[PDB]
């Protein structure tokens, strides 16, 4: 089974937020769901728990400040609302299962940037060798906010010899590079693309890495 | 049994 | 709040070798229904956690037996008899008897493995991004081991500092490498007033990369 949270948000500082969580299959819909604080680099600390049978939510007393707890009726579907955001609030939050199942099953987002910057979307480079066994490319993915971008190669076919480094903000902007070791007889003849998705600039490149000259 | 909160 | 005190912070195994952790409460974690709810959980970066050990002992349903767990009341240990590649990431214990659920800091296990160099690769400023006015020279340090290891870049023999920006990745789960990018950001008039670019990585060293920008 899986937990379904929604996608990356990018939020004012005063705003709000609602996260989401869908389970997969029915049979874990009554299980209570717990939500999780995991902020960059760091540890963990739980916010609260639903039991989606009578709508009961625990918290942990440090975020009744900032989180309410509810589910839609199917009980498919546990929600966070984040109140009055400050930047603190920048990190990943999961929800897991409970009960019986206590933290077995975790979902895999939720990022949330509190900032007020506008979205830039990155630009993208093709790094071709130009001037033995095996060739190495590259993708350079330079000044883009907020994040993720999600950076593939050959929608996936390829991902044996990838490194994808984490990005580096740079006076107000990411920057991340992604390299890829294929073997010599593949390319040129064969494309190598790197596909570069930046969702809160509803952005999306796929650039071949051509030979120079 | 099982905490509530759990 | 039940404070939980994760040891060691950071680890370090040699393949085979064996690992441990301790998890010690400022509470008792024993629950009136006589059961204990520890958990063990082991998270890869970027990733999410996966659980390994629930009520103290129990291994979950996918987990390999090098794992136990053992314990009572306020000392828990997690043991792998022998750590492999896979095993990477930050271990936490949770507790659960008491409100609110709390997690130690962490445990960051690391392999330990044989010496390797990086391979190392240079990239002049593609056409595209000159066309725009800057220029970004990359250079990848890919798979090498111990951890630590510099670049160090040479505009035309001398040692330019300012413009560089670095990223390093974490532990590799196969091989257990290490790998890195750094990149040289000049603007496109001053990356066209030289010529030799170089890229140096002191760690087998130092290994070097260049190219001329007139070819």
């Not at chain 1, 939510?57 to 609302?81: C, G, R």
């Not at chain 3, 040891?7 to 010690?24: D, E, H, M, R, Y």
């Not at chain 3, 659920?101 to 445990?107: D, I, Q, S, V």
């Not at chain 3, 390797?116 to 090498?144: D, M």
């Amino acid at each position: 089974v899986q937990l379904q949270q929604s996608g990356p948000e990018l939020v004012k500082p005063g705003a709000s937020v609602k996260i989401s969580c869908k389970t997969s299959e029915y049979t874990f819909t009554e299980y209570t769901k717990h939500w999780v604080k995991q902020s960059h680099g760091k540890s963990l600390e739980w916010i609260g728990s639903i039991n989606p049978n009578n709508g009961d939510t625990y918290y942990n007393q440090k975020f009744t400040d900032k989180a309410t707890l509810t589910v839609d009726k199917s009980s498919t579907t546990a929600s966070m609302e984040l109140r009055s955001l400050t930047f603190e609030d920048s990190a990943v939050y999961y929800c897991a299962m409970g009960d019986s199942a206590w933290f077995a099953y975790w979902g895999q987002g939720t990022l949330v940037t509190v900032s007020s910057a506008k979205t830039t979307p990155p630009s993208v480079y093709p790094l071709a060798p130009g001037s033995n066994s095996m060739v190495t490319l590259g993708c350079l993915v330079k000044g883009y906010f907020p994040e993720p971008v999600t950076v593939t190669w050959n929608s996936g076919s390829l991902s044996s010899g990838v490194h994808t480094f984490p990005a580096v903000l740079q006076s107000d902007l990411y920057t991340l590079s992604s390299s890829v070791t294929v073997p010599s007889s593949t390319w040129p003849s064969e494309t190598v693309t790197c596909n570069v998705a930046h969702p809160a600039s509803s952005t999306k490149v796929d650039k071949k890495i051509v030979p120079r000259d | 049994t099982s905490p509530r909160h759990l | 709040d039940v404070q939980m005190t994760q040891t060691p912070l950071t680890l370090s195994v040699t393949i085979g070798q064996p690992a441990s952790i301790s998890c010690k409460s400022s509470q008792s974690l024993l629950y009136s229904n006589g059961k204990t709810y520890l958990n063990w959980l082991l998270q890869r970066p970027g990733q999410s956690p996966k659980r390994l050990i629930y009520l103290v002992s129990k291994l979950d349903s996918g987990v390999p037996d090098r794992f136990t767990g053992s314990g009572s009341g306020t000392d828990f240990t997690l043991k792998i008899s022998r750590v492999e590649a896979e095993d990477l990431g930050v271990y936490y214990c949770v507790q659960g008897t008491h409100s609110p659920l709390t997690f130690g800091a962490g445990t960051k296990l690391e392999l330990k493995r044989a010496d390797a160099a990086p391979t190392v690769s240079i990239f002049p400023p593609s056409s595209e991004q000159l066309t725009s006015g800057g220029a970004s020279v990359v250079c990848f340090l890919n798979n090498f081991y111990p951890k630590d290891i510099n670049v160090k870049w040479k505009i035309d023999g001398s040692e330019r500092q300012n413009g560089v920006l670095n990223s390093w990745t974490d532990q590799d789960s196969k091989d257990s490498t290490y790998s890195m990018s750094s990149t040289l950001t000049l603007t496109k008039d001053e990356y066209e007033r030289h010529n030799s670019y170089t890229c140096e990585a002191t760690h087998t060293s130092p290994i070097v990369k260049s190219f001329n920008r007139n070819e």
